[PDB]
Amino acid sequence: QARGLGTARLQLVEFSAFVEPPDAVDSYQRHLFVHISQHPPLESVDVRQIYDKFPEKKGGLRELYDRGPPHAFFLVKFWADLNWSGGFYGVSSQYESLEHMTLTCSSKVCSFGKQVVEKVETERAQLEDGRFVYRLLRSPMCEYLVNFLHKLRQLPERYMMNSVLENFTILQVVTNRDTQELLLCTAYVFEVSTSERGAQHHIYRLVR
């Protein structure tokens, strides 16, 4: 059914993680580590295969999928661009719905399948052109991720970065804060891209 990352209840408009150098105040520039812009059917990947790559018990993938709805589950493979010092590291997300809601967005960093960091934010709907928009713009990246990126940047070989990234995942759960029904669940897995190629991504439906 799904052709992009979203459902009929909540569509991802844009997502990106970036850094702006200290000199961005003079001449502006931002480096994008990963970036999705949503301005045929998607491919499918069975969710059982990636269970162990995300935490267990409550808030883990199997219990989340168990809860449903199954069509709300996506996997995004990222080729991150780590080719960009004390600048600003940020994440920005924008979603769109037909109805007015208060969203709770939970993001989980997992390492070898265990939760390491979690950030939980709420966002109330804002009524715009015929539809509601939810704007979580310019969240400071947590210090864990910034230090991770700084070290990962420093590894002498790409396949080493890739081996390290094999064990690092992010799970993003968006729910209706009032009714607790799940709206969107996105599993992110990561590889490093090659210098001249910037960030790229591939989106899959998660089935069972």
Ligand X SMILES: *C(=O)CCCCCCCCCCCCC
Residue 127 C-beta: closest distance to ligand X, Å: 27
Selected from 5, 10, 75, 91, the binder of ligand X by CB under 6 A is 91
Residue 163 C-beta: closest distance to ligand X, Å: 14
177 binds ligand X (CB under 6 A): no
Instruction: Please state, in angstroms and rounded to a whole number, the distance separating the CA atoms of residues 34 and 196.
Output: 14
Helix count and strand count (H, E) for the chain: 3, 12
203 binds ligand X (CB under 6 A): no
Q: C-alpha angle with apex 71: 66 to 74, nearest 5 degrees?
A: 90
Site size for ligand X, by CB under 6 A?
Answer: 14
109 binds ligand X (CB under 6 A): yes
Nearest CA to 148 out of 89, 203, 66 is that of 89
Selected from 5, 10, 12, 17, the binder of ligand X by CB under 6 A is 17
Q: Which residue is nearest to ligand X (CB)?
A: 142
Burial of 10 (0-12, 13-18, 19+ CB in 10 A): buried
Selected from 62, 67, 77, 119, the binder of ligand X by CB under 6 A is 119
Selected from 42, 117, 155, 189, the binder of ligand X by CB under 6 A is 117
Beta strand 168-176 with 102-111 is antiparallel
Instruction: Please state, in angstroms and rounded to a whole number, the distance separating the CA atoms of residues 16 and 154.
Output: 22
Residue listed under structure tokens 């059917």: 41
Instruction: Please state, in angstroms and rounded to a whole number, the distance separating the CA atoms of residues 194 and 174.
Output: 31
* Binding-site string for ligand X from residue 49 to residue 78, where x marks contact by CB under 6 A and - marks none: ------------------------------
182 binds ligand X (CB under 6 A): no
189 binds ligand X (CB under 6 A): no
Q: Write out the residues near ligand X by the rule CB under 6 A.
A: 17, 33-34, 80, 91, 107, 109, 117, 119, 141-142, 145, 170, 190
